């Protein structure tokens, strides 16, 4: 219940700004269907079906000490939130409906009050809220009205909306999973084994014709807009270079001659032959990680493969 | 320090050019002036703008054979006849050049309710609730001779024995 927003150049959270929130409700993704009805047949063909948009709603109110200040506070809200600038929203929850604790009415152990006139139930460090999950959402704002209930309390009804892709982009790459350097950004929503360096954590293999990958993301990383990015030290010289993959298509690189120690950066629908001067004419096919086991099969025992990606959720 | 017996009720049907009619044998009585505050409160203050009143007056009575007035009240309730009524307090006469006039509260409306009740070997009473059109008007009113003579209401003066008088 804070509605964190990471904008291009800053980080903001509402309750820091005197802005309590009632709740956050996140719709699912609007499935746009594409059916076609045959003329006299009791059944209609599916041309397609496709996720579109994940409309968020967040009603937030605010109290202040005096009626004038309402105006300022409201303006702050707009200047703080209503941003066409695609932002990264992060949801927050509490772990408990906190109450005031027992005290002693002996002219001592009195109660605290926040900067806003409320009772601080958060006595200890471990009371305040948490990033409930290690993911974000690429988000933009839609129109709000501000009904002023009595006093200094005024409500607002934010209506956020997904920007590019209706998915729960996981923050942090898969290499931070590999190297346990960055802390946070890994919630139990992702069923992740502790065996760092073990299987289903590793995306850095060496000297293999074929290997195994566990894509922890329920949603499939077929869309190029996702940050799926591979880089391979090819290991062995060749004239052509095929690699296959399951839950995806076959990939070739024919017609250009390579060398062993040369490396390929295989970005989404894009191929850096040696990091620059992209040679992407050969078999334009992009790979697709669906969920769980995504087994790959090279053909000449690359001396290194490693690939970072982002986990996406539905 | 005021006995209710003193207060008196006078009735009349509006489009009738006659003198008022007292209401006899009313036990209870009541006169409620409600109000509805047409108030609009800013977000940084408060205000009252107006008031819609819902005045009315209630009464009981006991249905003695002599008078047919209760029948008139009933005919009103069922026929929606406009009646003008005023309570004219006795023993509070005029001050300046006014001695026979008496303090009063004049108001007109329609009788929005009437309802009797009766039990075994019991007098048959009734209860009427009468609306009030708008605001009432106060003003010293004079009584009609009929009401005056009724007000006296002396009881069984001294008669004599052994056939001199009944």
From TrEMBL, chain A:
This is Siphovirus-type tail component RIFT-related domain-containing protein. It holds the Pfam family Sipho_tail. InterPro entries: Siphovirus-type_tail_N. Residues 7-161 form the Siphovirus-type tail component RIFT-related domain.
Automatic annotation (TrEMBL), chain B:
Pfam families: Phage_tail_2 (PF06199). This is Major tail protein. It comes from Staphylococcus phage 80alpha.
